[PDB]
């Protein structure tokens, strides 16, 4: 790494300020807590013992075989690594070709020039497990307050007060939460839930002690209280989330594999000569099949098509999801008991599109067995046939038996029209029961009515280019009686130019009552954004108007229309005024109306909702907020959504971060971010526009990996002082382009620009100015400055000085 | 002696909506990140407020609707090309046109919430210059 | 001798024995109530009033029959009063006319029960009377036992008080609900009465009844009974004072009741009974 | 190897500083960024302090440049300024190949910089409608009465193709015009976002 | 119409990128030994070199090219070498276009033409260069110089 200063500036001499960047300083240590990089990426930070070597710097690192396994380097592609021990130095610079060293202690980094041909493979978008923040030992508090103003004509004096409270606690790696309310009518506390969960990093599980619920996939949702051992899928990356078959291919030599889909290229990478696996295909069931080919160098291309299916019950080969729950049964009913049960599920993936699953429920008086096999065959879609053999117990001392079955089919097509998505045909006998029926007992026959057969149907349709037909309907049968539960829904979605047209239709039918209910309404949305003139600050803009007409085909003809928009520039105050009219059906008319004023400030949210009708009038009001009690004090802000990203900025008084409306910074200098992610990377930007004249930040890009339920800080060093512009001249000669100007009194340094100009930030009234452009041969320019006390109310001052030697 | 037959019926009444203009801003993005096929922007959480429900409502099902395209995602109504909208939740479910979601209603406070998320991504890569316009209609169903 | 009837058919099964089918019309009176009046339906006449004379009289040991055999009462035989079952022979009644005149026999019953009555199905045993018929032609005598059977479902009250209806079905509206219950109580003598509430409950204050349905029951919805101003609990004697002989109601109001927090939409159905207690 | 943020940077009056994203693409090469501030006349002006003028970029990495203001309100408030910005790129080379005679290159990207004043009357969204012409026999003079900057591209006088031309405010610009041109003049202007405006005609007086 | 969500967002296009490429001189002074010739004659082998333009946006339509550097006192249209002691004595580097024409050194942008390109497809500019002896003969040494490829957007 050597640059030529001849074309850098047009004379023989410009600054000996080119050595410092690439190989600037050599040093004997060693252990000074340096980071470890691998092809420009922060992996981890360890302590590497440096020894005496023969290189550009003079020192070589010393690693082992086990430390290179978690880094990413393939140990199987390197011969002679396995013959060595596990406690000696590995000569990577001599054995592995083209592997140089690069040590920079100025910013604590260590780069490794390793080519991708000798590296191993991993999914695109991998996140290291050792860069997870468990949290900061603090607490958590959240609350909400609401009220009502219901008033009528005859007997219209009533009031309501709904108060909420959320207590949280995070000490170490434990997540303790608590929820409670406070009702007040015109009157005591009421506990809802309290659990204690704990994440598992090596076994990839999620331990939960206390209140919880199971998954809805195999069995219906059961609220329980106790232990809960299950795995999470949120720790897995987005490139491996979904279904993707394993592509098996054999390449003779170095080729180029371009995975194409629907005439478009979606993947392009080089493959090593021999066997290769592809596991970076996203989940796209409704996009046809795949066209994977190999472009060999001679001109021999293997054209082959692979079908694809999309069923959420089917898993991928190499994945295993399990769930084991234990505890008592709590449903909140006053006519049920609290028995004991034991639910345990297990899912394993098999090759050639095969999946095996099954689980059991071990209670004292309940035994249910399930056994399902999923078959994927390609061009015929998929099929998942399961068998459910349960054994319940009636409370009047009578044992009975029964089996169940569920028919599930899926089918996809690419370009003939739209395809089907889900069809479910459930079938059972008369002696079939559930877990919740056995728990319902108030002893000392009650009921004999369960489900018989369930049929689901949802067919979507896309005709043309700007039209979408949606059709959906359900079906349910019961034993004995002729009650048929049907729920048909149909909608139309079309957009002509900018205006959107919507025509929906519903058809509901219950079993406890008579009469088939239906509704035929429409929706017209005309946005007033591009139809009018556009200027800088209107304050009337981002306006839109809605128009809906309802008709239940029974004489009742109602309507709905409302105009909503924005008023402020920062989009914090939201208004929504809508109205309508009634008439027909049963002889009931009236002119309803609504007026909701949503406002979102920095400290707390507040809204005013005015409601109006013929004989019922009320007002909506409520004040929310969140209190964050930390070690440095109490910082207010918006109510959290189980994600705490704390920003520590001492000196910042009005800096909005980026992307948030109304989120600002308090007088102390702290900021919170309720809208962020979990187990991934984030970007916290800082705007320096409202940090007008005393605080100058250095950087504004933060990259942290938070977790679910933790507090992550954000270090941003600020500077206190005023800035000034000077002109340093070294004995009637200008300074070269690029030098170093430091100060003993202040933290900052400087970079000398053209014609002897230097920019400094955070400098005092007086201080020693040290100039050293080249190598340390002599102390030559040592000067100072003296700002006048009159010039203080300015943004930038310009003056000159002179070196004393 | 004298028998008295008492028969009643409990019906379901709709609730009252509070929020109807939750505008999610994306900000400004670069074309270098959406050049490669298979990238996305950062997530943006959003929720709804469904309070003041009378006696007779415990299961609230929300239905989604909107314009679609040939891929299966939402159709952009702006002047931009090769960019779509994706709607998900806190369980890893793809919410397409006609998707339903049924949650439970608390009795101690009589409220209901729907937490959602809207991000920005491309499929084929190489996003063009234009605006992003999308209208999502959510109809509330009571049962 | 032929007791020809118009409402039923007196088929002579077993010679002199027959099963007449008459109606039942209980008349609530003062002191002695009426149960079966045979003086308005059965017409006993004579085809030969000049050559033979019928002498219908009653023997001894003729009590009731069936489920009403444990009761007692009195009997009216052509104006003369006698207790039910007569220990001795009642005097004879002459019969020498072709005119279809009735048989003046009225059956009464002593009220030993307060308000309730015994349900009698159609075609059942009511009372067993052993009659006796002689003549002036000779000294011969033949015995025969007649049975009183029913032809409809008429519940005969025992006491001296009678309610309006026994099967009242009310229809509640869809929550709120406030409807009155039409029930009138009348008696033949001004005496003190007392009612109470008795049913299946599961609360602590004994004012909320249970909800036992068959198809999709409701949770957290109870049936609460009350008057115009006071909620009446379970097992409490509520008096009204001097009960007149006119149309006297109770003034009840059926309302809903919330016990639990979570209310699920279902069907509401319960069983409410009442029992009058003398004071 | 050098990719800037945009083709142009809009600097409105009243702001403090702007941002300029620089994204490198070459992972196996090290480039040096050297920037300065020029003018339309050629004088290397120093009325705009830029921060870090000298910094190295290794591999695929993205940075952000900052441009301050050091003019002290010595500009007229009736028109805009036409300034230029240069980004010089310096590549790297090996150590063991100095015994040969190779040849290196230098890459400088010339981008423009504008200075929009505050509190004006006519907004720039419809600043391209007012455009008067003067059709000479051998030339063409454009008239820009609006005090703004207009970039006229794809100038067609019928079946002939001309080149680009920049017109300053309250001045005249004489360009070449062939004798075999048509009658109507079709042109498409350029907005502030760097997009392409559609076609629009115009009759003169 | 009960609940509506308005999604807003705007993006910007990126500009073009320039990929450089070095050029090695392997002439090994063949015609510079026995010639003893005037400055107008220069028989040197043409060494081609190209500039890679790998992918742009829709915001680039026409650009300008140029070549700046340090001229020589004998001729301003020639590229001089480095002022060292281990070099030759009198040379010049002549730049050529695709149409084999003399490129004017240090020419301003007010006397140049535009160059239309096409987005989507990759662009490749094929340029040429040669050497030119100036002084009475060429000594042995090292041939080292520099050049500058400055573009200009719209």
Curated annotation (Swiss-Prot), chain B:
Disulfide bonds join 15-53. It comes from the Bacteria. GO terms for cellular component: pilus; pilus tip. InterPro entries: Adhesion_dom_fimbrial_sf, Adhesion_dom_sf, Bact_Fimbrial_Adh_Pro. Keywords: Disulfide bond, Fimbrium, Signal. GO terms for biological process: cell adhesion; cell adhesion involved in single-species biofilm formation; cell-substrate adhesion; mechanosensory behavior. Involved in regulation of length and mediation of adhesion of type 1 fimbriae (but not necessary for the production of fimbriae). Involved in the integration of FimH in the fimbriae. Belongs to the fimbrial protein family. This is Protein FimG. It comes from Escherichia coli (strain K12). The gene is fimG.
Curated annotation (Swiss-Prot), chain C:
It comes from the Bacteria. Keywords: Fimbrium, Signal. GO terms for molecular function: D-mannose binding. One of its GO terms (biological process) is cell-substrate adhesion. One of its GO terms (cellular component) is pilus tip. It is found in: Fimbrium. Pfam families: Fimbrial, FimH_man-bind. InterPro entries: Adhesion_dom_fimbrial, Adhesion_dom_fimbrial_sf, Adhesion_dom_sf, Bact_Fimbrial_Adh_Pro, FimH_man-bd. Gene3D superfamilies: Fimbrial-type adhesion domain. PANTHER family: FIMBRIAL SUBUNIT ELFA-RELATED, TYPE 1 FIMBRIN D-MANNOSE SPECIFIC ADHESIN. Involved in regulation of length and mediation of adhesion of type 1 fimbriae (but not necessary for the production of fimbriae). Adhesin responsible for the binding to D-mannose. It is laterally positioned at intervals in the structure of the type 1 fimbriae. In order to integrate FimH in the fimbriae FimF and FimG are needed. Belongs to the fimbrial protein family. This is Type 1 fimbrin D-mannose specific adhesin. It comes from Escherichia coli (strain K12). The lineage of its organism: Bacteria, Pseudomonadati, Pseudomonadota, Gammaproteobacteria, Enterobacterales.
From Swiss-Prot, chain D:
The keyword DNA-binding does not apply. It comes from the Bacteria. GO terms for biological process: cell wall organization; chaperone-mediated protein folding. Keywords: Chaperone, Fimbrium biogenesis, Immunoglobulin domain, Periplasm, Signal. InterPro entries: Ig-like_fold (IPR013783), PapD-like_sf (IPR008962), Periplasmic_pilus_chap (IPR050643), Pili_assmbl_chap_C_dom_sf (IPR036316), Pili_assmbl_chaperone_bac (IPR001829), Pili_assmbl_chaperone_C (IPR016148), Pili_assmbl_chaperone_CS (IPR018046), Pili_assmbl_chaperone_N (IPR016147). Pfam families: PapD_C, PapD_N. Its main location: periplasm. GO terms for molecular function: protein folding chaperone. GO terms for cellular component: outer membrane-bounded periplasmic space. It is found in: Periplasm. Required for the biogenesis of type 1 fimbriae. Binds and interact with FimH. Belongs to the periplasmic pilus chaperone family. This is Chaperone protein FimC. The gene is fimC.
UniProtKB/Swiss-Prot annotation, chain E:
Pfam families: Fimbrial. SUPFAM superfamilies: Bacterial adhesins. InterPro entries: Adhesion_dom_fimbrial, Adhesion_dom_fimbrial_sf, Adhesion_dom_sf, Bact_Fimbrial_Adh_Pro. One of its GO terms (biological process) is pilus assembly. It is found in: Fimbrium. It comes from the Bacteria. The keyword Disulfide bond applies. Disulfide bonds join 16-56. Transmembrane segments: none annotated. Keywords: Disulfide bond, Fimbrium, Signal. Its main location: other. GO terms for cellular component: pilus; pilus tip. The record marks 153 as: Required for stability and transport. Involved in regulation of length and mediation of adhesion of type 1 fimbriae (but not necessary for the production of fimbriae). Involved in the integration of FimH in the fimbriae. Belongs to the fimbrial protein family. This is Protein FimF. It comes from Escherichia coli (strain K12). The lineage of its organism: Bacteria, Pseudomonadati, Pseudomonadota, Gammaproteobacteria, Enterobacterales. The gene is fimF.
């Amino acid at each position: 790494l050597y640059f030529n200063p001849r074309f850098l500036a047009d004379d023989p001499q410009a600054v000996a300020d080119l050595s410092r960047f690439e190989n600037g300083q050599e040093l004997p240590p060693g252990t000074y807590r340096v980071d470890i990089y691998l092809n420009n990426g922060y992996m981890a930070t360890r302590d590497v013992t440096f020894n005496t070597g023969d290189s550009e710097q003079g020192i070589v690192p010393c690693l082992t075989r086990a430390q290179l396994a978690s880094m990413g380097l393939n140990t199987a592609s390197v011969a002679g690594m396995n013959l060595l021990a596990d406690d000696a130095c590995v000569p990577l610079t001599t054995m592995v070709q083209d592997a140089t060293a690069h040590l920079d202690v100025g910013q604590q980094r260590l780069n490794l020039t390793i080519p991708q041909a000798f590296m191993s493979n991993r999914a695109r978008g991998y996140i290291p497990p050792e860069l997870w923040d468990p949290g900061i030992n603090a607490g958590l508090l959240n609350y909400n307050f609401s009220g009502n103003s219901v008033q009528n004509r005859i007997g219209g004096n009533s009031h309501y007060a709904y108060l909420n409270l959320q207590s949280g606690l995070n000490i170490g790696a434990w997540r303790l939460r608590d929820n409670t309310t406070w009702s007040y009518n015109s009157n005591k506390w009421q506990h809802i839930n309290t659990w204690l969960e704990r994440d598992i990093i090596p076994l990839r599980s999620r331990l939960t002690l206390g209140d919880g619920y199971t998954q809805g996939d195999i069995f219906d949702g059961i609220n329980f209280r106790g232990a809960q051992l299950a795995s999470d899928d949120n720790m897995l990356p987005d490139s491996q989330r979904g279904f993707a078959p394993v592509i098996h291919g054999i390449a003779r030599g170095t080729a180029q594999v371009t995975i194409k889909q629907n005439g478009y290229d979606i993947y392009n990478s080089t493959v090593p000569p021999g066997p290769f696996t592809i596991n970076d295909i996203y989940a796209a069931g409704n996009s046809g099949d795949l066209q994977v080919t190999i472009k060999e160098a001679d001109g021999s291309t293997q054209i082959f098509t692979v079908p694809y299916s999309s069923v959420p019950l089917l898993q991928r080969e190499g994945h295993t999801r399990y769930s084991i729950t234990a505890g008592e049964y709590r449903s909140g009913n006053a006519q049920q008991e609290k028995p004991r049960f034991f639910q345990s599920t297990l899912l394993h993936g098999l090759p050639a599109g095969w999946t095996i699953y099954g689980g059991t429920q071990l209670a004292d008086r309940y035994r249910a067995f399930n056994f399902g096999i999923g078959k994927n065959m390609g061009a015929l879609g998929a099929l998942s046939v399961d068998m459910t053999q349960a054994n319940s117990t009636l409370p009047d001392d009578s044992q009975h038996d029964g089996q169940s079955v569920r028919f599930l089919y899926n089918k996809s097509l690419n370009e003939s029209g739209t395809n089907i998505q889900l069809v479910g045909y459930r079938y059972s006998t008369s002696g079939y029961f559930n877990f919740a029926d056995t728990t319902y007992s108030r002893m000392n026959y009650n009921l004999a009515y369960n489900k018989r057969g369930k049929l689901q149907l949802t067919v979507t349709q896309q005709l043309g280019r700007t039209s979408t037909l949606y059709l959906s309907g359900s079906h349910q049968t019961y034993w004995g009686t002729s009650n048929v539960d049907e729920q048909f829904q149909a909608g139309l979605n079309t957009a002509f130019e900018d205006i959107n047209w919507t025509l929906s239709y519903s058809l509901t039918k219950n079993a406890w009552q008579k009469g088939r209910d239906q509704m035929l309404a429409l929706n017209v949305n005309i946005p007033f954004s591009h139809w009018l003139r556009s200027d800088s600050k209107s304050q009337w803009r981002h306006a839109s108007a809605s128009y809906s007409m309802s008709h239940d085909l029974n004489g009742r003809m109602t309507n709905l229309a409302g105009v909503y928009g924005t008023l402020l520039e920062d989009n914090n105050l939201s208004y929504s005024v809508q109205t309508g009219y009634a008439g027909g059906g049963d002889g009931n008319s009236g002119s309803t109306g609504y007026a909701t004023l949503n406002y979102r400030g920095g400290y707390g949210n507040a809204n005013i909702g005015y409601s109006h009708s013929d004989d019922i009038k009320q007002l909506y009001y409520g004040v929310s907020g969140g209190v964050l009690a930390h070690a440095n004090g109490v910082t207010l802000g918006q109510p959290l959504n189980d994600t705490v990203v704390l920003v520590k900025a001492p000196g910042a008084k009005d800096a909005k971060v980026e992307n948030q409306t109304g989120v600002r910074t308090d007088w102390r200098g702290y900021a919170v971010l309720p809208y962020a992610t979990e187990y991934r990377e984030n970007r916290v930007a800082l705007d320096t526009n409202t940090l007008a004249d005393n605080v100058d930040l250095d950087n504004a890009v933060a990259n942290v990996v938070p977790t679910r339920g933790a507090i992550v800080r954000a270090e941003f060093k600020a500077r206190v002082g005023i800035k000034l512009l000077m002109t340093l001249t070294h004995n009637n000669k200008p300074l070269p382009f690029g030098a170093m100007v430091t100060s003993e009194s202040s933290q900052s340094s400087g970079i000398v620009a053209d014609n002897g100009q230097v920019y400094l930030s955070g400098m005092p009234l007086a201080g020693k100015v040290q100039v050293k452009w080249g190598e340390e041969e002599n102390a030559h320019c040592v000067a100072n400055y003296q700002l006048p006390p009159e010039s203080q109310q300015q943004l930038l001052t310009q003056l000159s000085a002179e070196c004393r030697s | 002696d004298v028998t008295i037959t008492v028969n009643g019926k409990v019906v379901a009444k709709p609730c009252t909506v509070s929020t109807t203009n939750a505008t999610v801003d994306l900000g400004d993005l670069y074309s270098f990140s959406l050049m490669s096929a298979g990238a996305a922007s950062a997530w943006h959480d959003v929720a709804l407020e469904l309070t003041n429900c009378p006696v007779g409502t415990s299961r609230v099902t929300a239905s989604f609707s909107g314009a679609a395209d040939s891929t299966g995602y939402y159709k952009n109504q702006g002047t931009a090309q090769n960019i779509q909208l994706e709607l998900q939740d806190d369980s890893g479910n793809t919410l397409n046109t006609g998707a339903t979601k049924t949650v439970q209603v608390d009795d101690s406070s009589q409220s209901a919430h729907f937490p959602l998320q809207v991000r920005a991504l491309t499929v084929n890569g190489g996003a063009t210059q234009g605006t992003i316009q999308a209208v999502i209609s959510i109809t509330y169903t009571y049962s | 001798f032929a007791c020809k009837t118009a409402n039923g058919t007196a088929i002579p099964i077993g010679g002199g024995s027959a099963n007449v089918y008459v109606n039942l019309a209980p008349v609530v009176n003062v002191g002695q109530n009426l149960v079966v009046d045979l003086s308005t339906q059965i017409f006993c006449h004579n085809d030969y009033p000049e050559t033979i004379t019928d002498y219908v009289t009653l023997q001894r040991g003729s009590a009731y029959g069936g489920v009403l055999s444990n009761f007692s009462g009195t009997v009216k035989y052509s104006g003369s009063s006698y207790p039910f079952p007569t220990t001795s022979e009642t005097p004879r009644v002459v019969y020498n006319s072709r005119t279809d005149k009735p048989w003046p026999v009225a059956l009464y019953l002593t009220p030993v029960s307060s308000a309730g009555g015994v349900a009698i199905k159609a075609g059942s045993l009511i009372a067993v009377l052993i009659l006796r018929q002689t003549n002036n032609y000779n000294s011969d005598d033949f015995q025969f036992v007649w049975n009183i059977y029913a032809n409809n479902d008429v519940v005969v009250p025992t006491g001296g008080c009678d309610v309006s209806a026994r099967d009242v079905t009310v229809t509640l509206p869809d929550y709120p609900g406030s409807v009155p219950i039409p029930l009138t109580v009348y008696c033949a003598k001004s005496q003190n009465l007392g009612y109470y509430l008795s049913g299946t409950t599961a609360d602590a204050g004994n004012s909320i009844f249970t909800n036992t349905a068959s198809f999709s029951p409701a949770q957290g919805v109870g049936v609460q009974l009350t008057r115009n101003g006071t909620i009446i609990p379970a097992n409490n004697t509520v008096s009204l004072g001097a009960v007149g002989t006119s149309a006297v109601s109770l003034g009840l109001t059926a309302n809903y009741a919330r016990t639990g927090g979570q209310v699920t939409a279902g069907n509401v159905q319960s069983i409410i009974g009442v029992t009058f207690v003398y004071q | 190897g050098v990719a800037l943020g945009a083709t142009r940077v809009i600097y409105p009056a009243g702001q403090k500083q702007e941002q300029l994203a620089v994204t490198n693409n070459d992972e196996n090469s090290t480039y040096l960024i050297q920037s300065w501030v020029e003018n339309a006349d050629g004088v290397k002006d120093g009325r705009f302090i830029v921060t870090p003028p000298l910094f190295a970029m290794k591999g695929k990495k993205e940075n952000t440049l900052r441009i301050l203001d050091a003019t002290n309100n010595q500009l007229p408030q009736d028109r805009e300024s036409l300034f230029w910005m240069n980004v010089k790129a310096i590549p790297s080379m090996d150590k063991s190949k100095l015994t040969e005679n190779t040849l290196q290159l230098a890459i400088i990207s010339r981008i423009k910089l504008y200075y929009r004043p505050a509190k004006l009357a006519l907004p720039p969204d419809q600043a391209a409608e007012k455009l008067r012409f003067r059709r000479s026999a051998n030339s063409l003079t454009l008239i820009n009465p609006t005090p703004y900057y207009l970039t006229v591209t794809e100038l067609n006088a019928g079946t002939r193709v001309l080149e680009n031309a920049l017109v300053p405010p309250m001045g005249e610009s004489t360009v070449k015009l062939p004798s075999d041109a048509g009658s109507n003049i079709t042109y498409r202007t350029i907005n502030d976002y760097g997009a392409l405006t559609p076609k629009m005609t115009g009759v003169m007086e | 119409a009960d609940s509506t969500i308005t999604i807003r967002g705007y993006v910007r296009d990126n500009g073009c990128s320039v990929a450089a490429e070095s050029t090695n001189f392997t002439v090994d002074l063949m015609e510079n030994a026995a010639k003893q010739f005037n400055n107008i004659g220069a028989t040197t082998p043409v060494v081609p070199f190209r500039i890679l333009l790998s992918p742009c946006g829709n915001a680039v339509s026409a650009v300008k090219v140029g070549f700046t550097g340090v001229a020589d006192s004998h001729n301003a249209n020639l590229l001089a070498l480095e002022n060292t002691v281990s070099a030759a004595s009198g040379l010049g580097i002549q730049l050529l276009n695709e149409q084999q024409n003399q490129i004017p050194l240090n020419a301003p942008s007010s006397a140049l033409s535009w160059t239309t390109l096409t987005p989507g497809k990759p662009n490749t500019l094929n340029f040429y260069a040669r050497l030119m002896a100036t002084q009475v003969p060429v000594t042995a040494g090292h041939i080292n110089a520099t050049a500058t490829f400055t573009l200009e957007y719209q």
